[PDB]
From a paper:
F0F1 consists of a hydrophilic F1 domain responsible for ATP hydrolysis or synthesis and a hydrophobic F0 domain housing proton translocation across the membranes. ATP hydrolysis/synthesis in F1 is coupled to proton flow in F0 through the rotation of a common shaft. F0F1 from the thermophilic bacteria Geobacillus stearothermophilus is one of the best characterized ATP synthases because of its structural stability and simple subunit structure (α3β3γ1ε1δ1a1b2c10). The γε rotor in the F1 domain (α3β3γ1δ1ε1) is surrounded by a cylinder composed of three noncatalytic α and three catalytic β subunits arranged alternately.
To obtain ATPase-active F0F1, we constructed a mutant F0F1 with a C-terminal-truncated ε subunit (ΔεCT-F0F1). The prepared ΔεCT-F0F1 was subjected to dialysis in phosphate-buffered saline to deplete the bound nucleotide, as described in the Materials and Methods section. For ND-ΔεCT-F0F1, the structures of two rotational states without nucleotides were obtained at the following resolutions: state 1 at 3.6 Å and state 2 at 3.4 Å, with the γ subunit positions differing by 120° in each state. Further, we obtained the F1 parts of states 1 and 2 at resolutions of 3.4 Å and 3.3 Å, respectively, using focused refinement of the F1 domain. The structure of ND-ΔεCT-F0F1 significantly differs from the structure of ND-wt-F0F1 in which three catalytic β subunits adopt “open in βE,” “closed in βTP,” and “open in βDP”. In contrast, all three β subunits in ND-ΔεCT-F0F1 adopt an almost identical structure of open conformations as follows: “open in βE,” “open in βTP,” and “open in βDP”. There was no nucleotide bound to the three open β subunits of ND-ΔεCT-F0F1, but a density corresponding to phosphate was observed in the βDP. This phosphate may be derived from the phosphate buffer used for nucleotide depletion. Our findings suggest that nucleotide depletion from the F1 domain causes all three β subunits to adopt an open conformation. All three β subunits in ND-ΔεCT-F0F1 adopted an open form, implying that the first ATP can bind to any of the β subunits.
Author numbering:
A (entry chain B): 24 to 501
B (entry chain F): 1 to 470
C (entry chain G): 229 to 284
D (entry chain E): 1 to 352
E (entry chain C): 252 to 377
């Protein structure tokens, strides 16, 4: 009766309890006789509480539990790029095993106060509205919050695709998503060619709650290795709300006292421990960076809800998506009042910085000119020009699916809008004007594009204006 | 031998068994130093704090850090005293963690340095001050409308980016300049990025040479998130009780302290409360707050930032916290965008001391008149747009003019803003600002341009600025 | 005078229609708040009941 | 061994104690067949489902029928596998309960027919189809405004007397005629008279010749009311996999499935979730829905009717269900009172 | 002894919270809002001792002025209702009226006195 190898006593709802394992350490990995991993939380006086990280159907009372000697770890390496793995690092897509040689603990301390550094490098999402109004830094924690079916996954996919030549590793973590949706996302990423620099970590809805709870930590652990090696990493969490729901399920199963909305009081710690790991390392530590784009799904746009408030309290700023205008086919409107990037602003390059202020002012004027100002025919003041320019801005901010726009073209089109060159062209032709303008630029204004791409600043106004006028002369209105 | 072993590990709670007759007292500190004996173990250096006596010579403790790698049967030693933190002038210009170890790269602290316990009984009834002593902060709006009190707790409200850090730095600098008193900043459970930004801001403003810093940011365990406030407080207590000088204390967020207490009580196993909080909410908060008082040999006054969960102001944690405050200062984004930079709302700022008994009858009358005029302007603001400037009486136009003058005069130029604006800034005595507002209310400056009142100190600055204008 | 009477009738038309629309817009938000309050009451009551049953 | 003995009966919850080393696995089926030994006992024919391992060689189970007449010490036999339900051609045109026994008077199924486990892991990542396909139904409104995705879940809204049954029958008929694929109906928590009326309507219309029907009545215990959906799904899985043909799956009301799950969780004694639901609500719904997908050689698409408690779309059960829906079709009493069929609202309807 | 005594309890809500904490630490079963069942009895015992003794007992008296602190003027809360159901009347103070300098901020409509009339001199009564 050597008792350094355990024996199961109670099994139910994915939580086990084993007798023995005298030398086991808290947080260790234990393997059942079935071949299923498990993590040990509680070291009671006589028995050990084990959380099962897999299907518990095959686990019966009286089975054998063996130690592994390793604190919770995930395989990390260069070979992990382009694969699809579960939170334990096991391949799910097939294509043979993953040949890694290094591991990292799931629970790791965040960078200290002296280690960090203020962020100054832009993250080009490739979306006009985001890159103009709500910039993203390379060490920023920016939350994307909205109701269901508001294109959050589309925004994430576009952002990941836009990193093709920016030498940035991307990680996509899908919590609670449908497996068919995850497979289609992987398919479109492969089709656009993002698999050369991205990692997909999946945990579908049918998986047990512990895997859902562990997935974001595995993703950030995979990111940390590249971040400390000196590279730049982007990580996307698909649903921290679903992760919090899974954690609530586990806590209720473990007979813990719940708090507001039946959530345990540890939910804020759960989210902060994860979102505190994204930072911009100083030059002393290496200069690496890891940025996070968590998603939160709300009901009826209720910002007052517990999880949205907790996540907002942690992140630097949030981007709000509205389901009101999603029905029109437009990429859902970024609520100007509720969207802010406090850390951003310093990230924006000089070219976009010189025009974002006036673009924001024009959009604010148009939005404050509500339907009440659109009634009657007495609006003969500059309010009519304000309405026309606001319609122009809203029409320009529209974007197609999976078509990221380079920052140079974004700057050029926004400058063209703000300098009144589109005040006369009708609304319905604005998108065709923009597309033909991109073609005209790629054909003739290569010197302007190179100048912007090199010096991160605008070319001469007297030259760019002539370029725009030449394109306008070439153009024809419908 | 006072040497014990681990019998239970569960989350941040660890149970230790001791020899009979050698149980450590409550709030004692236990040390666990372990060296891995093979490749199936990890080195552990951990500190614990005694919480309960469970009987059978077993002691239940809370962890100051992560408990990963702990193994049942590990050896535990006791320090025989609660957590001890270095005090004195060696703490100035330094950053400390919950254990008192220096976080910055400026080296460690010699072992002979004096250390004091975290836990201490509150000062007795005899030692307290017998009457209210107003604290002259040198800021016009604060010293006029919502005065601060020595030994009083002030609740600070407002989001991020509305001048909170600038106001904190200005207050620290002014107190250190005019009262010779240092300040202590306790980063209880907030963003590490914000902590680093504030550290760099103070370092390049030069204020750090007279302040100490303790950081308990969000990623730390509940034990640290609880005890950071206490270690900051015990750093300030030394300066209050030895140097006999006034001290400022800043708590980055007091709600995180009670949230950590709620998190750890459930692990301890106590029965929950109305909203799942700890049953000991009121007594714990009182034990923390009652040490920030005024004595015959100095005082400690604290500026505390508050958070509300789910924007519910009737929540037990804010409800308990609010019973200790003495004044409230509100920061308005509209004022911030208008550009007056004390960034503080003049109508939402309230104080228990705004009474003629404490601040004087003339000061009370001036404050009441200014509040009434500003309220009248705010009410007029509706007809100002609906009816335009037309259909306003002479009284309405005059009160709009005077209110514009008063609003522009409420702004001030800070010593901190010198590094970005060039002008040095000034310190305005309470009597001087009362005199200036009396003169403005009497109409002696109804002919001067309203822009001459921006970012000035005493009343003479307005006259000189007007002469410069024309 | 006749034109003024027609104008005041049209103005009352518009004012009443706006009042009805505002009332409906208030109704929807009040219903949302009511649903949130109902859920909060149910969860608090059930939590208290289960805690009381578990205390023994 | 194979024999166990009852040691605790508490309402619909029965606990069985086996000999050491031979406990059945979770979700196994336990059979109790007893004959009255004298005049102080009654005959018992009952089926139990294993839920928990309580330790001390005891097992906690939930009953699929009435537990009256149970005696402590009665022998219990284990089947060694979860509930097994006949699959194949013999299931067409028949009516089954949760346990797979035929309900109608057509005659019992021979015991040598193939049977399949109820609980089954969802299809893996490799097996799923890579691209989205559109299922042509042949109805103009659906095919134009709210297309149906193969392997997708469709929410059906509308009260009685607006055309739900007619729409269901026409969908089955069109799919069978123009694709060759059968449909399966699963009446979770139905009203018995309404189920009988629907059965007679299908029998008259001739649709029943190419469909399989599963009924869970409201007078059945929560275990049966919860497992009826799973037995219908596993009936459809055989035709998805072996025959390799597209299948329709109709669920009468999934909210009653969630309610039965909450009831059984309350019986087991787990701490309640947000508004009293089971803590495992999300994972139970996931384990049900994730098996309705499209594979390389077939697909299952589902039409599910949804009831909204107190007309609250933020309620946890509708919120959890809506996260899986691909399209929505609404029925309108205004269109019904007008001379228009199928009376599907062209504006309220939506589709991903 | 025949004297007259006035007693002012500065806050009964704090005492109720302390009693709740003590009961929860003693592991008693909680009731509404985690309060113990005898929360009403706790205040009834204390407040029922205030009385006007008869002429045979000596004619002594003891009046009480308990204080209750509401949250945003929520008079319908558990402890305020329990205390109101025990005392004779109540005096309500308004934050809005306090802010405008009206000290005291008595709310005449809400405030009632159940022993009105007999407690006033003839001139004041008339």
């Amino acid at each position: 009766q050597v008792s350094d190898v355990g024996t199961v006593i109670q099994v139910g709802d994915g939580i086990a309890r084993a007798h023995g394992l005298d030398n086991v350490m808290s947080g260790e990995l234990v393997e059942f006789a079935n071949g299923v991993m498990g993590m040990a939380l509680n070291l009671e006086e006589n028995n050990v509480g084990i959380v099962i990280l897999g299907p518990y159907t095959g686990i019966k009372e009286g089975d054998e539990v063996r130690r592994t000697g390793r604190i919770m770890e995930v395989p990390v390496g260069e070979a992990l790029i382009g694969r699809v793995v579960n939170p334990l690092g096991q391949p799910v897509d097939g294509l043979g095993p993953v040949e890694t040689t290094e591991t990292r603990p799931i629970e790791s301390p965040a960078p200290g106060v002296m280690d960090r550094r203020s962020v100054h490098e832009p993250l080009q999402t490739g979306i006009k509205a985001i890159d103009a109004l709500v910039p993203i830094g390379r060490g920023q924690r920016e939350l994307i919050i909205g109701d269901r079916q508001t294109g959050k996954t589309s925004v994430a996919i576009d952002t990941i695709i836009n990193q093709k030549d920016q030498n940035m590793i991307s990680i996509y973590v899908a919590i609670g998503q449908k497996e068919s949706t995850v497979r289609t996302v992987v398919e479109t990423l492969r089709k656009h060619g993002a698999l050369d620099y991205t990692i997909v970590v999946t945990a579908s809805a049918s998986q047990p709650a512990p895997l859902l709870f562990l997935a974001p930590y595995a993703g950030v652990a995979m990111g940390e290795y590249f971040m400390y090696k000196g590279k730049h990493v982007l990580v996307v969490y698909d649903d921290l709300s679903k992760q919090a729901a899974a954690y609530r399920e586990l806590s209720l199963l473990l007979r813990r006292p719940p708090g507001r909305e039946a959530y345990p009081g540890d939910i804020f710690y759960l989210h902060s421990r994860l979102l505190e790991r994204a930072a911009k390392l100083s030059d002393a530590k290496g200069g690496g960076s890891l940025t996070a784009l968590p998603f939160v799904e709300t009901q009826a746009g209720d910002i007052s809800a517990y999880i949205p408030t907790n996540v907002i309290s942690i992140t630097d700023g949030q981007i709000f998506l509205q389901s009101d205008l999603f029905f029109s086919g437009v990429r859902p409107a970024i609520n100007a009042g509720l969207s802010v990037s406090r850390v951003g602003g310093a990230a924006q390059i000089k070219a976009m910085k010189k025009v974002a202020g006036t673009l924001r002012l024009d959009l604010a004027a148009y939005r404050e000119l509500e339907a009440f100002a659109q009634f009657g025919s007495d609006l003969d003041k500059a309010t009519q020009a304000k309405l026309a320019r606001g319609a122009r801005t809203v029409e320009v901010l529209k974007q197609d699916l999976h078509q990221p726009i380079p920052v140079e073209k974004q700057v050029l089109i926004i400058y063209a809008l703000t300098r009144g060159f589109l005040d006369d062209i009708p609304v319905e032709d604005v998108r065709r004007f923009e597309k033909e303008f991109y073609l005209f630029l790629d054909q003739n204004g290569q010197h302007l594009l190179e100048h912007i791409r090199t010096t991160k600043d605008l070319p001469n106004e007297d030259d760019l204006n002539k370029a725009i006028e030449a394109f306008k002369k070439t153009f024809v209105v419908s | 031998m006072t040497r014990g072993r681990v019998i239970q590990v569960m989350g941040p709670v660890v149970d230790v068994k001791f020899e009979n007759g050698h149980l450590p007292a409550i709030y004692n500190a236990l040390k666990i130093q372990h060296k891995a004996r093979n490749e199936n173990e990890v080195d552990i250096d951990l500190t614990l704090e005694v919480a309960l006596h469970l009987g059978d010579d077993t002691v239940r403790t809370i962890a100051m850090a992560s408990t990963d790698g702990l193994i049942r049967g590990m050896e535990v030693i006791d320090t025989g005293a609660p957590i001890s933190v270095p005090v004195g002038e060696v703490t100035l210009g330094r950053v400390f963690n919950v254990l008192g170890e220096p976080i910055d790269l400026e080296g460690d602290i010699p072992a002979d340095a004096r250390r004091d316990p975290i836990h201490r009984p509150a000062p007795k009834f005899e030692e307290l001050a017998t009457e209210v002593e107003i604290l002259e902060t040198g800021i016009k709006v604060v010293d006029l409308l919502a005065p601060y009190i020595k030994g009083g707790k002030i609740g600070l409200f407002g989001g991020a980016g509305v001048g909170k850090t600038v106001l904190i730095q200005e207050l620290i600098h002014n107190i250190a300049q005019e009262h010779g008193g240092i300040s202590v900043f306790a980063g209880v459970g907030e963003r590490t990025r914000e902590g680093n930004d504030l550290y760099h801001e103070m370092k390049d403003s030069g204020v750090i040479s007279k302040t100490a810093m303790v950081f308990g940011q969000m990623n730390e365990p509940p034990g640290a998130r609880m005890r950071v406030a206490l270690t900051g407080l015990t750093m300030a207590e030394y300066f209050r009780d030895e140097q006999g000088q006034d001290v400022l204390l800043f708590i980055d967020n007091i709600f995180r302290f009670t949230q950590a207490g709620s998190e750890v009580s459930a692990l301890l196993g106590r029965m929950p409360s109305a909203v799942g909080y700890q049953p000991t909410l009121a007594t714990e908060m009182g034990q923390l707050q009652e040490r920030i008082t005024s004595t015959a040999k100095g005082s400690i006054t604290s500026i505390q930032a508050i958070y509300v969960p789910a924007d519910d102001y009737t929540d037990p944690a804010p409800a308990t916290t609010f019973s200790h405050l003495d004044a409230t200062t509100n920061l308005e984004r509209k004022l911030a965008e208008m550009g007056i930079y004390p960034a503080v709302d003049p109508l939402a700022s309230t104080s228990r001391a705004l009474a003629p008994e404490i601040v004087g009858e003339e000061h009370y009358q001036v404050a009441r008149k200014v509040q009434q005029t500003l309220q009248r302007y705010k009410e007029l603001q509706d007809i100002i747009a609906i009816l335009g400037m037309d259909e306003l009486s002479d009284e309405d136009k005059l009160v709009v003019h005077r209110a514009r003058r008063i609003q522009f005069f409420l702004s001030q130029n800070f010593h901190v803003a010198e590094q970005f604006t060039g002008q040095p800034g000034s310190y305005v005595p309470v009597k001087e600002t009362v005199r200036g507002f009396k003169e403005i209310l009497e109409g002696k400056y109804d002919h001067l341009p309203e822009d001459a009142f921006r970012l000035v100190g005493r009343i003479e600055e307005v006259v000189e600025k007007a002469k410069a204008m024309g | 005078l006749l034109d003024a009477k027609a104008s005041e009738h049209a103005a009352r038309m518009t004012a009443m229609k706006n009042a009805t629309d505002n009332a409906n817009e208030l109704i929807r938000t009040l219903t949302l708040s009511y649903n949130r309050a109902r859920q909060a009451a149910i969860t608090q009551e059930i939590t208290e009941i289960v805690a009381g049953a578990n205390a023994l």
